[PDB]
Amino acid sequence: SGAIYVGNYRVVNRHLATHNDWANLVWEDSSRDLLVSSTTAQGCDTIARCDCQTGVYYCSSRRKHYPVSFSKPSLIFVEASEYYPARYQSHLMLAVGHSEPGDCGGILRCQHGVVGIVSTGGNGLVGFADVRDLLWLDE
Ligand SMILES: NC(=O)[C@H]1CCC(=O)N([C@H]2CCCc3ccccc32)C1
Numbered sequence: 001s002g003a004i005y006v007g008n009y010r011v012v013n014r015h016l017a018t019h020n021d022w023a024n025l026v027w028e029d030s031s032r033d034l035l036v037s038s039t040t041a042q043g044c045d046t047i048a049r050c051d052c053q054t055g056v057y058y059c060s061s062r063r064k065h066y067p068v069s070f071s072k073p074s075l076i077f078v079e080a081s082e083y084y085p086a087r088y089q090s091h092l093m094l095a096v097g098h099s100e101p102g103d104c105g106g107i108l109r110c111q112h113g114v115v116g117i118v119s120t121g122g123n124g125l126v127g128f129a130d131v132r133d134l135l136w137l138d139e
């Protein structure tokens with residue numbers, strides 16, 4: 001679990017969005033595993049606007065943060081789960097590190113701010129859904 005709170009927006013993994021997220025829907029993209037909903041209270045998270053390929057993410061299944069080197073956002077094949085059939089997930093970044101299904105939502109940050117959230121994993125890999133291209137989150 002986990003979310004990004006920026007301005008009047010909440011960013012979550014689409015497969016973990018609640019009834020309240022869907023009732024306050026702003027934008028969603030199944031191919032990216034993202035959903036953004038509106039909030040009443042103001043969020044203070046900062047979104048990175050950069051091309052960093054190193055950062056630190058929070059891993060809830062280890063109660064720890066880990067430093068990572070990650071690939072640029074790209075179209076990556078992801079195996080079927082109870083939430084999606086096997087498909088290409090877009091805007092996904094991979095890195096070597098621990099991740100289990102419950103780790104989805106953990107934030108990846110660089111020195112500029114939030115880069116993305118955990119979305120995939122297994123086999124000693126962790127995949128992050130990028131949010132740096134969503135410029136409208138800042139306005
Ligand atoms: N983006 C997706 O398609 C995810 C939907 C929910 C979900 O459980 N996953 C799984 C795939 C198998 C390994 C695994 C490890 C860590 C995190 C997530 C997963 C993928």
Ligand SMILES: [Zn+2]
Pocket residue numbers: 048049050051052110111112113
């Ligand atoms: Zn950065």
